Structure formats: structure tokens, C-alpha cells
Amino acid sequence: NQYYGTGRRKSSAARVFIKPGNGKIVINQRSLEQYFGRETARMVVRQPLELVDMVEKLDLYITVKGGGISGQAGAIRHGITRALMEYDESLRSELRKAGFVTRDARQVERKKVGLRKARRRPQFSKR
Amino acid sequence: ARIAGINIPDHKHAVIALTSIYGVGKTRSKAILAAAGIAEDVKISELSEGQIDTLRDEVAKFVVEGDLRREISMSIKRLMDLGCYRGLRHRRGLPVRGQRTKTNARTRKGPRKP
Amino acid sequence: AKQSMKAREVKRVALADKYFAKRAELKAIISDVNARWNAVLKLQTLPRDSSPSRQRNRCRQTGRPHGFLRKFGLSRIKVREAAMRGEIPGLKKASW
Amino acid sequence: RIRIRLKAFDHRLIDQATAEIVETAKRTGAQVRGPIPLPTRKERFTVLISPHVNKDARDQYEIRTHLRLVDIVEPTEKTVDALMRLDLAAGVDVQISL
Amino acid sequence: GQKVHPNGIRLGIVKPWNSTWFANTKEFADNLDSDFKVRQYLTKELAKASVSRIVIERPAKSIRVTIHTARPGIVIGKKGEDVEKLRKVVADIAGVPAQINIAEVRKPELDAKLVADSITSQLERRVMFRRAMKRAVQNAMRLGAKGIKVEVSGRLGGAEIARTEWYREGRVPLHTLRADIDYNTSEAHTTYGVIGVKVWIFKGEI
């Protein structure tokens, strides 16, 4: 059966489907490259296969919407370690130590009346 | 490489060079390398005189340089003469187009003094 | 805020639909690629306060012409004076 | 075959004319493609709080609006008498057609 | 001048809303004012009817108008009369037609507005502002109220120089959102100025 992991991170949300096969990676019907493999953090989408091997062992067709270049590559990265669910929980311990398991809960903080932007405070002079 | 104006430009890419003229600003330039049929990133090296005088005629078409300055100055003088607001302002050395003068008029007012 | 200044604003809405919207529509088409017998525009000799763009937009209760809102038809002053007594459905101090 | 759009500003309520409408259907004729949630549009009105000066003060109010779908597939002349005449809920808005 | 309106900050929880109706922008305008018009006319009319709080709702092309009072039989008149002459012109104002509901006010000494109104009504009758506050406060601790406080403001009695002077007895956590707190407002238009009353009545939690 399709052995799944969701994952998401800041405004993005990627869904990662697993199925032992090759070393090929689909996303939004794209090559790892044709989406952003050749931009900042191609290596990080693959990352969730470091202490846990692949090189051509298991397949992964995915999608993901919302956010941006690195939010989407963060969402997916989460989903992969989430899908490594199915392949026991033995592997999902050095995935903790990896950090990849956690949901990066850091959100864009609101623009709050009185300020210029969240923290940014209107420069003032006394006189 | 002289052309149209007293100006004697050239020695880098063409469209850019042409702008030198007082009357061509990127658009009038693109439009002439196209209305004379010439490469537009080409220097004057390889650029025959034969080509240069074809362009010289194209620019001849519009009021560039000296004529432009005079015509453009006539236009401003006409203003003043009529004794209208846009002119009364030209003679008083202040912004024509309404810009505030309570502050920051500087450009059309000459560096501040007293 | 000054009856008179209110009154003004009422006659303005009155005429605003008597002539304009109605009889003034004769300028939309009366000024489109339909060429000319220039009597076409000339006719803008009507009450002046007949135009809608002449209407200010005043706090329905107090007349204040500033700090108004189309939702509540009130000045931000009254909007709140009511908001804090329910008064405005669904409306409450929000955060996020 | 017939869906009823539903909206009100109070939530602990709209889903009470929802689960009333839905109920007053399955019991009768029946069918109803469940009650769908659907994007709750939230207006936000933020205004100055002082009668004069102090642009940094201000109150920030909102108006949440909630939607519910319905969708009933089998229009039983009975369930028609079950929508009608078995209804009310003053602060809710119902749209029969689309 | 830095307290959040106690009623308002509750709403979401523990406090209601004196209009429930729904409308969508286009009419939200003309609706809001209509409401003002009714609460206006009805408060001048039922002035001496000890009315504590008037609720409005328009259910499809209709306006209901509920009226919380502590003298129902005054609002209602001879076997239904006054309600009519009201309902009549209340539906006249809103245009759309109008029923009308007279909810009885149980133990009015607990209703903020009806407290304030009294203190007001008295200051204009010309009574010792200190006394009235203190009377008010008791009749409430008397009938349960797990706390209350009233304050007045300015030219209290006469003083060219204006004062406030409150009076808290019991508990009044204007910070606990759970806390049932009935807060309202009444001004007294005196011969020497305008005195403003705020009563808080603490009723419990959850």
C-alpha cells in the first residue's frame, strides 16, 4: 500500500508518498530539479535519507502548495521523515537527533498597530 | 564618428551611444537602429561609415540637439510672455507644476542660502 | 455638528438622484463614439448639488465627516460607543 | 438537487440550524450530502480610539461570518414540507437556490 | 482613562449582544441606524418605565424588539394598549413590521443600568450623592451580588472643582473574563453640570 507522510512548515504543506522502487523523486509532477533542485536546498529534500539509505531503493511522488522556495522544501523534508513512519520506528530516533521530525513552528509574526512591522518601531526624537 | 549633432560619440554599444544626442532617449534610439536596420549591441568597430550615414539621416528626421534646445527654450519663453501661471513661475525660479514650496523645492530653487 | 451643514448634505442626496443617475445618464452615452451637435455636454447647467460626488459621507448619528465607515455608517467614535454594548452584531474586539 | 447556503456571525448557533435542517431531512424523506463547513470570511475593522489625537491608540474589531452548505439530493415532497414549516433561527441566513 | 469596557470585552463569552441580527453590508448600514432610531424613541417613551435594556432582531423582513423592564405593566398599559401605540410606531420607523416583547426584570437592584439610572434620577431630584451610592451598593449585596462598585464624577453636589469618588464593596475582577459582570452607564444633567455614573455588579463565574 501507499505508505504516507504529510509534513508542512510555515504556510507551505507538502504530502509525501512512499513506495520502495528507485531513486527517483516526483513533486507537483516535477523532477527534483525542475521544481527547485538547482536552487537553495535541493540537498535538504534528499537530506531525510542520510542515516537511512536509498540511493535508488525507495520511491517518493509528492506535491506541496503554499509559502515559498524553502517553506515547500521544509514541508516535504518533514513529510519524508514522516513517511519513514511505515518503515518501523527504529529509524525514527536518529531522525529525532537529526531534527527532521519536529514541526518548525516558526510563523510570520503580525504587524501590530503603533509599529512599522511586528517589532520595527517608528524612530523617534524627543524634541 | 560625428552624426547629427556637433556631437562625436561612439566606442561602445550602439543604442547606448546614440542617447548621447540631445533628442534621443533609449526609445528614439531603438527605433532608429531598427529604422536603419542595424545590430544594436554593436560598437563602431566593423561599423562602416556607410552604415553611419544611413543613421545620420534617420536622426535628421527629428528636432534633436541645437534646434531642440532653441525650440524648447522658445516654448518656455512663449510661456513667460503670455504672463500666465506656468510662466510667472519660470521667471520667479520656482516649481511650475504645483510642488510644495513650503519646503523641498530646492532643485527648482537653487541651493538654499540665508 | 451644525444642523445647516447636515441639511446641506440631505438636499445633496435628494438632488443626487432627481437629476443625476436619472436625467444625467444623458452624458454617458451622450458622450461616446456616437459621432457633433455639441449641445451634447453643454447641458451640465443643473443644480450642482445634483452630482453625487458632491455628497460628503457623514457619521449617521453625529455628522462628523471624518473617521467614517461604510459598514456601520458611523464615525469611529460612535462605532465603538455602540460596539462595546453589543449594538453591532457579530462585532467584537479581535486578536490573532 | 437542492442546497441551502447558511450564514450567521455566531458559530455556536449556525451549526444548530445546520444540524436542525439536516436532521429535519434524514428523519423525513432524507439524503443530504452532510453539512459542509466552508471558508468563514472574517472582516476586520480597526479604528482610532481617542476622540482626538493619538493615532497609536486604536481598537481592532472583527466580524466573523460563518458558512454551511447542506446539499440535499433526494427532494421528497415530504422533506419539502420538512424544510418549510420546520425552521426559524432569527440570526441565520438561508439561501435555497444556489 | 485606560480601562477596557467591561461588557464589550466579555461578549464572545458570558455576555450577550443587544443585536443578534444578520445583514450583509448593503443593508448593515440602514439597519444599524434603524436600531438606533428604535432604542431612541423607545427610551424617551418608556423613560419612567424603568427599562433596563432593549434588544433588537430582524428575522427575514421583520423586526422583533425585546424590552427588558422592571415595570412591565407600565410598558404594557391597559390590557395591551401601550404596547400597540409602540409596536405601531416601532414598525413604522423600521419600515418592516414589528412585534414586541416585554421581558421582566427580576431583582433590578442587580441590573447595572437600572442602578445607574436611579443614582442619576436621584442626583437630579437633588439628593446626597454619597448617600445614594451607598444605598445602591447595599441593595445588591443584599440580594446576592458577589460584589459591586459605583463611581460618580464631577461637580459632585456643586464643587467648582470636579471629583469622582467611587465605592467598591465585595469582589469585582474586571480582568477575569469568565466573571459575570454587568457594567453600565448613566449621566445626570444637573443645574450645575453633568455627572456621570458607572456601576459594576459582580455576579459569579463560568
Next chain:
Amino acid sequence: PRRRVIGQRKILPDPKFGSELLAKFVNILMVDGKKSTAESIVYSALETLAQRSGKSELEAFEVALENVRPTVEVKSRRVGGSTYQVPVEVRPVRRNALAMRWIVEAARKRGDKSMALRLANELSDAAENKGTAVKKREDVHRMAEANKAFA
């Protein structure tokens, strides 16, 4: 830091060489939050340093850096009226937190046409410690040690 002492956030050991050290470097040189175009200039300048030194990458950075590192530094100190420049032996972790800060700072203040270029020439001057930044090491030791007295 009145009471709330802290640790130190850690960053992601560099998308090419696997070093945290460089990851701070790139950040340092980074601007207006452009990581996309940050390392771009750092790698290209580490590429000109790469073969223009031969020595390689890892080790050529290490030495050029090895120079601009300061051992001691003075620290303001407003006591009995006067400001009292007090010397203090500075920690390893920062010892090069500057070194990088100065190296990056030294290169923007430079004639070369591009940033890859500018940065490159700074590292290189430093390699043979004779650049702007290495001078900032010199004038820092020269500042303390004059306060040699205070200790």
C-alpha cells in the same frame, strides 16, 4: 543579558562543504537576507582563492583566517569618571567571529570590480597577512598592550 543568560543558536553547516564555520561567514557577508545570492559570492571567491592559491579550499581559508584572528582586546569601562580601556583575553568562539567580520568588512571597502573579486583579494592579502583586515588585528593588539598596565 541583565539576568537572562543564553546559549547560542547554531546554524546549518554550509550547503557545500559541511562547515558551520563558513555558514556563519556567508551569513556575515549576506545582506537583506539573500542566502540565494550569499554563498554564490563566497564560493566564487573561495574558487578564485581555490586555484589562485592551489593550496585548495578548506586549508587556504583556514590560514588566511588564521592571521586576522586577535588574541586580546580592550573593553570600555566607565569607572571613577574616566572610561578606562581595559584589556581582556578574548575567547576562541569570537576570536574568529571577528576575523570573519573584519575579513568581510575589509573587502566591501575595496576597489575590485565584484564581490567575489574583493573578498578573494582580502583572503589572499591575509594569507600573507598584509591586508586591511590583518591590520585591524595589528591595531587591536596595539590598542591593548598599551593598556598593558591595566590587567
Next chain:
Amino acid sequence: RSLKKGPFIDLHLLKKVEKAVESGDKKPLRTWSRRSTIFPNMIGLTIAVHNGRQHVPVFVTDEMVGHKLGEFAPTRTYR
């Protein structure tokens, strides 16, 4: 510079200029209409253009055409 499709002028002013043309120029000619686009059919006439306190005489001429009447009647006195 605006207007595009049908240049503008107040009726009372325009018919105050035919009350001259076919009739011969009277004294200066008073309008407050500082908006009105000047027409050839005004050249040689003198229009008194309001500016706040009074009307400034302005001899219309073979080139004040496109312009407005307000253009020749300063409103803010600065010495």
C-alpha cells in the same frame, strides 16, 4: 493635460462673449468662470477674471487659446 474628448467652458461666459462679438465689445467683461478653456472666439476681447478679491483684466490673444482664464489672474499675492 485633461479634458481629452470635448474641451470645456461655462455657458454664461460663452454667451457673455456673443453678447459682445455680434454686438461689439463693451467695457471689460466679468466672469468668475476661471475654469473655461479660452476660445479663438474670444481673442481681442478683455475678460475680467476673478481671483479672490477682484477681477483682473486680460486681453485674450492669438495663443492664450488652449489655456484657462484662471491662468492669467494670480490668486496668492506674494511680495
Next chain:
RNA sequence: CCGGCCGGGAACUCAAAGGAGACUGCCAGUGAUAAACUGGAGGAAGGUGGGGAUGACGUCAAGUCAUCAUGGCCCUUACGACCAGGGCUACACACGUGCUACAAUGGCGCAUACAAAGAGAAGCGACCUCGCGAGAGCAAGCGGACCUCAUAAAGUGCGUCGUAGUCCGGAUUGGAGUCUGCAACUCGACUCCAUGAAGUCGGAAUCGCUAGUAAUCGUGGAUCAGAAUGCCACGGUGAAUAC
């Protein structure tokens, strides 16, 4: 028709209602066997997780009689009311707040990936066609997770520019227009063609911010016929530093 597009599918994304979850509670170190802190565990979230709302009694006769209310005071064929035109937009200057720059971490051309949150019938306006353009004519869908505003920009590509008051910067002004509106002279906003100031990083002095923050990049909204570098909101990329 290779378009979730049609059957269907109820998984997943999400949508919005209702739930559980984090308690210093668990091991340990510290500390008086206390409070607490520190580190570790597990865990999406560890030590009030992140943010907001909430602002005690009180201080400044602090601000508001012009939001409204209101004691007193004064005008009343004028201190009221109506109309046109002007003025609040003036301009030797000074100070505060900001926007745009001085440029190759950039400018430019072409190709091209990825948001969020709002808005809407006297409205959002597609499509087509016309115009270099701003816009225009014609016309669909859309009271709207459906339709429209609406092609996010930073980014990545190639290429060009090569450190120059420049292919940086765009003021200023001439010329010609567009849209709104009775009406764009005073004073509207945009456009096309020319024009191309100051400005090469800013004395004394001074301000912001401790994390998805600063910095930078676009996006919408209230007001609003028209009029945002302001204000209020949105996400993109994403630091440095605290002895």
C-alpha cells in the same frame, strides 16, 4: 481532447465546528530535604512554547467644549443662513517624521519557480478587439473556497554592462496625451517622447530591533468619484549579537 477533466473516489491537502495534549510531571545535577533554576528524556510543541487581547490604586488642573453631550458665557436682520471665486497647496528659512538614491550583493534585456491575506453589484470586471502606452469599445462570469480584481516581487537562468556622475540615480522642465468628476488654471492621478539636478555612502549628534526578529522583497484594505512615499494588514527570502 492529457485540462481533476468525467466517472467516480472518501484517503490525503484544506475548509470550521468539537476534542485530547505541556503539569517543572519524568530521570538527574544544583540549591537548606524547600522554592526555583540547569541539563537530559520523550514529545508537534519544555519550563508562563510563539503572538495578541487584557493596562490596578493612582501621576501630569496632561489631551478633547470641533465627534457627541453639557454648567456658565456671548452673537442673533448676525458670532446664524444661502451662492460664486479664491484659500487651507503661499515660501529667505528651521526642525520632526518618512520615501528614492549614490550603484556591480548592482543596472538591463529575455526566459522562468514558489506566497499569504483581503476585496467586490451605484461593485470586481474577464474574453475579444483597438491603442507603443495610460486607457478604450464591446462583452462573460461573479453577492461569490466557483467569477473578477490578479501576470507576486525578491529568486534562478542565460546574456549584456566593467567601476565612469556611468547602460548608477532619477529630481526638474518641455512637448503630447489618458481616466475620474458640472469642473483637473490655482491643486488630481496616471501614461508615451524628449529632458537627466543634487547624490560616489553623509560633522557634531542621534534612532530601531534579541528570531522567522532585524534587514530586504513584493500583496491587499479602510478612507475614497478621483486623489497614498502615510496608515492598517499579508506572506516571500532571512541574518548578526548578548561576557
